[PDB]
Chain length 142, copies 3
């Protein structure tokens, strides 16, 4: 029940992080409005087009997949090499990946940060679910 | 001895990566100082009442909660499920962290960087202590 | 021979995420021309010798250090305590680093971004072969 609940943590959170890494940036280096009105780069905000929705997206899209990942990686992981439980694990991949993606996607389109409202808490709250499930178990093991 | 040691290392960094983020989320967004001069949402350097502290404050925390984390989790864990030692495990969590938290609320409150200069050194060395205390176990094994 | 592959995983990436995090702060807080023309800080971009390469390089190395870590270690951790193979986990550990070092450094140097387009695919493709090597092997442990 253990090792498998972890398999998909690779597949799914790769997509989540590093395929959203490979899409974003790859889509960016082709669309390059950079070499902007003659520049060395840095400073994001000459035309709206170039950087306005992108500099957020590149940051946000990176932000989202950055923020969730570690809490869902390590908290799980150092609990995961200890003999933990099935169902329990599986629902975190459903609360995290779904908690994040409805978090990530809502915050990319509509520009407004308040939209990051509803899912941002769905990401915060399996960290109340994960962290403790470690604590009582590991303490149970010893 | 091993698994109680890496035990409380989840909880230090659920309060530290994710309690801090949750608050710096929760209080930032309740008094939401956005919907700014009728703006499609980005930016963050007009009103001192709005951003200056917050934009510092919030990215201050994240920037600190991320950086020392990486080489604490990664570095520790390649070396955990391997065969560790106690007073050494148990310093790294307290050395790193109190190497971080008085680095993190320091740079927080008073804006001026000088502040972070000491305690950040008090944390950096731990990545070497871990580095060498990791590598020797890694050398005993071979 | 598992750990054999893994023992310099921990260390070499100290040179990457925290010996680079180190000099870059050690060096910055030191060289620092902060106190910037009368300044309670935040905002790093008046005079070039002070702000432009610094704030960039600081963050140029950083953001690059950040993004190689996760797929590499986290994908490499799950599938690690599991029964892997040296060559394999030697290919993945080597190519990534020598692919990301040319990536980080490139961008780091000539302020421009287009110089990064090259080795980040030579970083992202290991992401793609590591991410499968998890699932495949991780299907053979069940
Ligand atoms: N949205 C892309 C993410 C692609 C990505 O994961 N790139 C990593 C290595 S492949 C990186 O260090 N890129 C930083 C850069 O844009 O130069 C980005 O611009 O960062
Ligand atoms: N204050 C939060 C830090 C806490 C945190 O990790 N929040 C996550 C979990 S919802 C987030 O996706 N924040 C959305 C955002 O600000 O872009 C932040 O600005 O991001
Ligand atoms: N160039 C330095 C790199 C040194 C570093 O890794 N600093 C981290 C870890 S102690 C930090 O907490 N930075 C806060 C700051 O930059 O003031 C930086 O600007 O951060």
């Amino acid at each position: 029940p253990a090792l498998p609940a972890f398999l998909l943590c690779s597949t799914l959170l790769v997509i989540k992080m590093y395929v959203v890494a490979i899409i974003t940036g790859q889509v960016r280096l082709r669309k390059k409005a950079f070499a902007n009105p003659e520049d060395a780069l840095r400073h994001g905000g000459p035309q709206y087009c170039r950087s306005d929705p992108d500099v957020e997206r590149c940051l946000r899209a990176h932000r989202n997949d950055m923020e969730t990942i570690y809490p869902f990686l390590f908290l799980g992981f150092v609990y995961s090499f200890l003999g933990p439980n099935p169902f329990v694990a599986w629902m975190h991949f459903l609360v995290f990946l779904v908690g994040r993606v409805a978090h990530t996607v809502a915050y990319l389109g509509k520009l407004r940060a308040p939209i990051r409202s509803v899912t941002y808490t769905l990401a915060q709250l399996p960290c109340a679910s994960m962290a403790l499930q470690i604590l009582w178990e590991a303490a149970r093991h010893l």
